Amino acid sequence: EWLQAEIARLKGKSIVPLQQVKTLHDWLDGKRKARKSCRVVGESRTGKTVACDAYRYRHKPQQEAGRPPTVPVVYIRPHQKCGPKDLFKKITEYLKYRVTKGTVSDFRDRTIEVLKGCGVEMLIIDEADRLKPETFADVRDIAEDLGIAVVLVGTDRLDAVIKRDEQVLERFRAHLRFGKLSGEDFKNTVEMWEQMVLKLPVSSNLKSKEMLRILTSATEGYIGRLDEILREAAIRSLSRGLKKIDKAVLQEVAKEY
Amino acid sequence: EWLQAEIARLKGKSIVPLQQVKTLHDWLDGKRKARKSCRVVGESRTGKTVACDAYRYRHKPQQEAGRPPTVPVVYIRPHQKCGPKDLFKKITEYLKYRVTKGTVSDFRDRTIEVLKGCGVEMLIIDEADRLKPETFADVRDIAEDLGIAVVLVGTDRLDAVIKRDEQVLERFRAHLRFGKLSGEDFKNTVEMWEQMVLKLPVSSNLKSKEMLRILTSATEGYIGRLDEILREAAIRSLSRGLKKIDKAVLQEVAKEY
Amino acid sequence: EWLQAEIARLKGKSIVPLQQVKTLHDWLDGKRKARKSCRVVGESRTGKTVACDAYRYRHKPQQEAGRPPTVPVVYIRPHQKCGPKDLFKKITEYLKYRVTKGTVSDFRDRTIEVLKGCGV
DNA sequence: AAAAAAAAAAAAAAAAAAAAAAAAAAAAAAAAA
DNA sequence: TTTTTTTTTTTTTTTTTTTTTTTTTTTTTTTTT
Ligand SMILES: Nc1ncnc2c1ncn2[C@@H]1O[C@H](COP(=O)(O)OP(=O)(O)O)[C@@H](O)[C@H]1O
Ligand SMILES: Nc1ncnc2c1ncn2[C@@H]1O[C@H](COP(=O)(O)OP(=O)(O)O)[C@@H](O)[C@H]1O
Ligand SMILES: Nc1ncnc2c1ncn2[C@@H]1O[C@H](COP(=O)(O)OP(=O)(O)O)[C@@H](O)[C@H]1O
């Protein structure tokens, strides 16, 4: 069944180029060449993790000689209430280096060693709100001991937590802020996203004022909502024999959430 | 004594089908196939818990091969003031895997491991109100990390707690409601209940208005209350040498409860 | 330099099929089907190590099922004076499972678990 | 001058981070036959 | 040419101390029209 193949294909995830993504990539590349630490602030379901992650694929570490890998960008997602030891362990795990059983001071020394051996000019920390207040001192300690840029990606809680300590705030003053979709930006994004993700036999008439209206009402500018809504509508539309997404199907999916 | 066997039958619990149960089962099957998080909210004594139990029994784990048995659906019942560590322990023990000792980080790692190895399509959490606010920060983390359709089940209090965090509410936007029985639905439920759950030999027509008024006034549309009343009336009537429910016995029971 | 490229090729390692190796492979397949323990005794500098490694390459890990790797054949090289802890740990690490730091009893149970989950 | 449900100032429950002894058991090995 | 005693050498297994949050329950609300 061809429909089965399309269902399986849609149930996946794909990357669709966007302007804000390119802006973030260029800004972060500038910071990486300057070795200047910074932070990034945005709302949930805006796709900032996808931008931080898509950037790292381009700069994947490649080593041809017998010497160990030289990695320029390392990327870790801390768990809830991640402490100092837990964070160091993740840095070591990402570099495919054997964790040494021992104490926290041993973890600190080992982390400095593995980071000194490789490049690791830029470190992208996601979900920085979850980071425990005790650990930020270690983060900036690393940023000062070695010339490595540190990027703290978080929401408004990141702002709130950072502004409580003077040194951390001084270290991470420069920043980039994400926005939401609206107007022509939103319409162009919907058109581009459907052309990039949907290969349905017939057009969905997305440009129509009414479809844009209901998608705006259900989306509110959050790409993390538009992607899910349109993918579910597509799977359901194809499942009922409709090659294209239809107005009633859109209304149904929007009503469920 | 034949009456003793009948009494044993009446005291033991049984499961019957209802419109709400079938609706929930179809809805949850959809959510499980699409790997989407959702929640179930309704009043107490409406029987939604038994619906979850029946759904689990339908999807029995299958282990044809010598490898780890497939476990499609997981169902956990947290106790009062439940934390993250105990939640992880319950998930681990439900899958017949030993619980290694150590800090919470090890518990998170072990839980992710055992959930990856088995199928673990959808995870259902009964009486979700008992969980602490901090436990949701890990439930949602699992939902984002792996393709599991986490399902929260509880009362109206659940929404009041979920609204405290923007991200938790953003994750769960779909829901199904359970509610009271009334009118023709209530009358049909009573008539069906007399035939299946009760083991009385003759008569006991609860369709009539006189008995319906009693059961309606005492029950208030809650299915669990109805079950209690009918079983007790039948047992007491059998003890009194009666083979059919009589209005006087029905009246006597409800004023004690 | 072309000559240096040829030299770099000659300094490499190659594998050549011999009747000795094929005999060992057929024998090992028989023993695996029979699920019977056995042993191979052979002199030094005979290449039996390479033959066993090639056998391992014949059957690659089968990830075709959705949850575990289901690797049917494992191959470990113990160090000198290999203790029980190091043995269990090598077996565990070969299957991409983290080491549950503890006592040798914990390593024993953990190794049994990962050996049951995988084909082995 | 008489009446008011809402911020500060106080007790239990979990959770995590580090030395510091003590004994057993074995394995080799040098001297002595 | 093996045996006794030494000698070392791993190897393994077990007790005490401190700090930081979260959450909930009374008294105060003086301040306010
Ligand atoms: N550039 C993109 N292309 C395609 N899908 C995207 C993109 N950005 C975000 N998404 C959708 O949004 C989700 C990722 O958003 P998320 O990483 O949760 O945002 P954040 O982590 O910044 O809160 C994915 O499920 C994906 O489908
Ligand atoms: N389909 C059913 N068949 C038999 N008994 C039921 C059914 N649904 C509910 N009940 C009765 O109602 C009670 C169910 O309440 P419960 O499952 O605890 O719901 P809740 O969790 O909302 O309180 C049980 O005691 C059971 O006897
Ligand atoms: N079938 C073979 N193909 C290629 N080289 C071989 C083969 N058999 C032996 N060799 C050579 O012999 C060496 C392998 O010997 P080795 O594995 O050390 O034997 P063992 O360890 O059993 O003494 C390699 O350096 C390799 O070049």
Coordinates of N, CA and C in Angstrom, one line a residue, chain A residues 99-212:
Chain A
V99 N 34.5 7.4 31.1 CA 34.3 8.1 32.4 C 35.2 7.4 33.5
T100 N 35.9 8.2 34.3 CA 36.7 7.6 35.3 C 35.9 7.6 36.6
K101 N 35.8 6.4 37.2 CA 35.1 6.3 38.5 C 35.9 7.1 39.5
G102 N 35.3 7.9 40.3 CA 36.0 8.7 41.3 C 35.1 9.9 41.8
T103 N 35.8 10.9 42.3 CA 35.1 12.0 43.0 C 34.9 13.2 42.1
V104 N 34.4 14.3 42.6 CA 34.0 15.4 41.8 C 35.3 16.1 41.3
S105 N 36.3 16.3 42.2 CA 37.6 16.9 41.7 C 38.2 16.1 40.6
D106 N 38.1 14.8 40.7 CA 38.6 14.0 39.6 C 37.8 14.2 38.3
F107 N 36.5 14.4 38.4 CA 35.7 14.7 37.2 C 36.1 16.1 36.6
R108 N 36.4 17.1 37.5 CA 36.8 18.4 37.0 C 38.1 18.3 36.2
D109 N 39.1 17.7 36.8 CA 40.4 17.5 36.2 C 40.2 16.7 34.8
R110 N 39.4 15.7 34.9 CA 39.2 14.9 33.7 C 38.5 15.6 32.6
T111 N 37.5 16.4 32.9 CA 36.8 17.3 32.0 C 37.8 18.3 31.3
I112 N 38.6 19.0 32.1 CA 39.6 19.9 31.6 C 40.5 19.2 30.6
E113 N 40.9 18.0 31.0 CA 41.9 17.3 30.1 C 41.3 16.9 28.8
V114 N 40.0 16.4 28.7 CA 39.4 16.0 27.5 C 39.1 17.2 26.6
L115 N 38.7 18.3 27.3 CA 38.4 19.5 26.5 C 39.7 20.2 26.0
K116 N 40.8 20.1 26.7 CA 42.1 20.6 26.2 C 42.6 19.8 25.1
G117 N 42.4 18.5 25.1 CA 42.9 17.7 24.0 C 42.3 18.0 22.7
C118 N 40.9 18.1 22.7 CA 40.2 18.3 21.5 C 40.1 19.8 21.3
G119 N 39.4 20.2 20.2 CA 39.2 21.6 19.9 C 38.1 22.1 20.9
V120 N 36.8 21.8 20.6 CA 35.7 22.2 21.4 C 35.7 23.7 21.7
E121 N 35.7 24.5 20.6 CA 35.8 25.9 20.8 C 34.4 26.5 21.3
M122 N 33.3 25.9 20.8 CA 32.0 26.3 21.3 C 31.2 25.1 21.9
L123 N 30.6 25.4 23.0 CA 29.8 24.5 23.8 C 28.4 25.0 23.8
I124 N 27.4 24.2 23.3 CA 26.0 24.6 23.3 C 25.3 23.8 24.3
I125 N 24.8 24.5 25.4 CA 24.0 24.0 26.4 C 22.6 24.3 26.2
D126 N 21.8 23.2 26.1 CA 20.3 23.4 25.9 C 19.6 23.2 27.2
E127 N 18.4 23.8 27.3 CA 17.6 23.7 28.5 C 18.4 24.2 29.8
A128 N 19.0 25.4 29.6 CA 19.8 25.9 30.7 C 19.0 26.3 31.9
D129 N 17.7 26.4 31.8 CA 16.8 26.7 33.0 C 16.9 25.5 34.0
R130 N 17.0 24.3 33.5 CA 17.0 23.1 34.4 C 18.3 23.1 35.2
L131 N 19.4 23.8 34.7 CA 20.7 23.7 35.4 C 20.6 24.2 36.8
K132 N 21.2 23.5 37.7 CA 21.2 23.8 39.2 C 22.0 25.0 39.5
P133 N 21.6 25.9 40.3 CA 22.3 27.2 40.6 C 23.8 27.0 41.0
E134 N 24.1 25.8 41.6 CA 25.5 25.6 42.0 C 26.5 25.5 40.8
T135 N 26.0 25.0 39.7 CA 26.8 24.6 38.5 C 27.2 25.8 37.7
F136 N 26.5 26.9 37.7 CA 26.9 28.0 36.8 C 28.3 28.5 37.1
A137 N 28.7 28.5 38.3 CA 30.0 28.9 38.7 C 31.0 28.0 38.0
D138 N 30.8 26.7 37.9 CA 31.7 25.8 37.2 C 31.7 26.1 35.7
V139 N 30.5 26.4 35.2 CA 30.4 26.8 33.7 C 31.3 27.9 33.4
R140 N 31.2 29.0 34.1 CA 32.0 30.2 33.8 C 33.5 30.0 34.2
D141 N 33.7 29.1 35.2 CA 35.1 28.7 35.6 C 35.8 28.1 34.4
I142 N 35.1 27.2 33.7 CA 35.6 26.6 32.4 C 35.8 27.7 31.4
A143 N 34.8 28.6 31.2 CA 34.9 29.6 30.2 C 36.1 30.5 30.4
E144 N 36.5 30.7 31.7 CA 37.7 31.5 32.0 C 39.0 30.8 31.9
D145 N 39.0 29.5 32.4 CA 40.3 28.8 32.4 C 40.8 28.5 31.0
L146 N 39.9 28.2 30.1 CA 40.3 28.0 28.7 C 39.5 28.9 27.8
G147 N 40.1 29.2 26.6 CA 39.4 30.1 25.7 C 38.3 29.4 24.9
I148 N 37.2 29.0 25.5 CA 36.1 28.3 24.9 C 34.8 29.1 25.1
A149 N 34.1 29.3 24.0 CA 32.8 30.0 24.0 C 31.8 29.0 24.6
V150 N 30.9 29.6 25.5 CA 29.9 28.8 26.1 C 28.5 29.5 25.7
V151 N 27.6 28.7 25.3 CA 26.3 29.3 24.8 C 25.2 28.7 25.7
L152 N 24.5 29.6 26.4 CA 23.4 29.1 27.3 C 22.0 29.4 26.6
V153 N 21.4 28.4 26.2 CA 20.1 28.5 25.5 C 19.0 28.2 26.5
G154 N 18.1 29.2 26.6 CA 17.0 29.1 27.6 C 15.9 30.0 27.4
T155 N 14.8 29.9 28.2 CA 13.6 30.7 28.1 C 13.7 31.9 29.1
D156 N 12.6 32.4 29.5 CA 12.6 33.6 30.5 C 13.2 33.2 31.8
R157 N 13.1 31.9 32.2 CA 13.7 31.5 33.5 C 15.2 31.6 33.5
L158 N 15.8 31.5 32.3 CA 17.3 31.7 32.2 C 17.6 33.1 32.5
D159 N 16.9 34.1 32.0 CA 17.1 35.5 32.3 C 17.0 35.6 33.9
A160 N 15.9 35.1 34.4 CA 15.6 35.3 35.9 C 16.8 34.7 36.7
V161 N 17.2 33.5 36.4 CA 18.3 32.8 37.2 C 19.6 33.6 37.0
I162 N 20.0 33.9 35.8 CA 21.3 34.6 35.6 C 21.3 35.9 36.3
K163 N 20.2 36.7 36.3 CA 20.3 38.0 36.9 C 20.5 38.0 38.4
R164 N 20.5 36.8 39.0 CA 20.7 36.7 40.5 C 22.2 36.7 40.9
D165 N 23.1 36.3 40.0 CA 24.5 36.3 40.2 C 25.2 37.3 39.4
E166 N 26.1 38.2 39.9 CA 26.7 39.2 39.2 C 27.7 38.7 38.1
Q167 N 28.6 37.8 38.6 CA 29.6 37.3 37.7 C 29.1 36.6 36.4
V168 N 28.1 35.7 36.6 CA 27.5 35.0 35.5 C 26.8 36.0 34.6
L169 N 26.1 37.0 35.1 CA 25.5 38.0 34.3 C 26.5 38.8 33.4
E170 N 27.6 39.2 34.1 CA 28.7 39.9 33.4 C 29.3 39.0 32.3
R171 N 29.4 37.7 32.5 CA 30.0 36.8 31.5 C 29.1 36.7 30.3
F172 N 27.8 36.6 30.5 CA 26.8 36.3 29.4 C 26.0 37.4 29.0
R173 N 26.5 38.6 29.0 CA 25.7 39.8 28.6 C 25.1 39.8 27.2
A174 N 26.0 39.6 26.2 CA 25.6 39.5 24.8 C 24.6 38.3 24.6
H175 N 23.6 38.6 23.8 CA 22.6 37.5 23.6 C 21.8 37.7 22.3
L176 N 21.1 36.7 21.9 CA 20.2 36.8 20.7 C 18.8 36.3 21.2
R177 N 17.8 37.0 20.7 CA 16.4 36.7 21.1 C 15.6 36.2 19.9
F178 N 14.8 35.1 20.1 CA 14.0 34.6 19.0 C 12.6 35.3 19.0
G179 N 12.0 35.3 17.9 CA 10.6 35.8 17.7 C 9.6 34.8 17.3
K180 N 8.4 35.2 17.1 CA 7.3 34.3 16.7 C 6.8 34.7 15.3
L181 N 6.1 33.8 14.6 CA 5.6 34.0 13.3 C 4.4 34.9 13.3
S182 N 4.2 35.7 12.3 CA 3.1 36.6 12.1 C 3.0 37.2 10.7
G183 N 1.8 37.5 10.3 CA 1.6 38.2 9.0 C 2.3 37.5 7.8
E184 N 3.0 38.3 7.0 CA 3.7 37.7 5.8 C 4.7 36.7 6.2
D185 N 5.4 36.8 7.3 CA 6.4 35.8 7.7 C 5.7 34.5 8.0
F186 N 4.5 34.5 8.7 CA 3.8 33.3 9.0 C 3.2 32.7 7.7
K187 N 2.7 33.5 6.8 CA 2.1 32.9 5.5 C 3.2 32.3 4.7
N188 N 4.3 33.0 4.5 CA 5.4 32.5 3.7 C 6.0 31.2 4.4
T189 N 6.0 31.2 5.7 CA 6.5 30.0 6.4 C 5.5 28.8 6.2
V190 N 4.2 29.0 6.2 CA 3.2 28.0 6.0 C 3.4 27.4 4.5
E191 N 3.5 28.3 3.6 CA 3.7 27.9 2.2 C 5.0 27.1 2.0
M192 N 6.1 27.6 2.5 CA 7.4 26.9 2.4 C 7.4 25.6 3.1
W193 N 6.8 25.6 4.3 CA 6.8 24.3 5.1 C 6.0 23.2 4.3
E194 N 4.8 23.6 3.8 CA 4.0 22.6 3.1 C 4.7 22.1 1.8
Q195 N 5.3 23.0 1.1 CA 6.1 22.6 -0.1 C 7.2 21.7 0.2
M196 N 7.8 21.9 1.4 CA 9.0 21.2 1.8 C 8.7 19.8 2.5
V197 N 7.6 19.7 3.2 CA 7.2 18.6 3.9 C 6.1 17.7 3.3
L198 N 5.2 18.3 2.6 CA 4.1 17.6 2.0 C 4.2 17.4 0.5
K199 N 4.2 16.1 0.1 CA 4.2 15.8 -1.3 C 2.8 15.2 -1.7
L200 N 1.8 15.7 -1.1 CA 0.4 15.2 -1.4 C 0.1 15.5 -2.8
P201 N -0.7 14.5 -3.5 CA -0.9 14.7 -4.9 C -1.5 16.0 -5.3
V202 N -2.3 16.7 -4.5 CA -2.9 18.0 -4.9 C -2.7 19.1 -3.8
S203 N -2.7 20.3 -4.3 CA -2.4 21.5 -3.4 C -3.5 21.5 -2.3
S204 N -3.1 22.2 -1.2 CA -4.0 22.3 -0.1 C -4.7 23.6 0.0
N205 N -4.4 24.5 -0.9 CA -5.0 25.9 -0.9 C -4.7 26.6 0.4
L206 N -3.5 26.6 0.8 CA -3.1 27.2 2.1 C -3.2 28.7 2.0
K207 N -3.0 29.3 0.8 CA -3.0 30.8 0.7 C -4.4 31.4 1.0
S208 N -5.5 30.6 0.9 CA -6.8 31.1 1.1 C -6.9 31.8 2.5
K209 N -7.6 32.9 2.6 CA -7.7 33.7 3.8 C -8.2 32.8 5.0
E210 N -9.2 31.9 4.7 CA -9.8 31.2 5.8 C -8.8 30.1 6.4
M211 N -8.1 29.4 5.5 CA -7.1 28.4 6.0 C -6.0 29.1 6.8
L212 N -5.5 30.2 6.3 CA -4.5 31.0 7.1 C -5.1 31.5 8.4

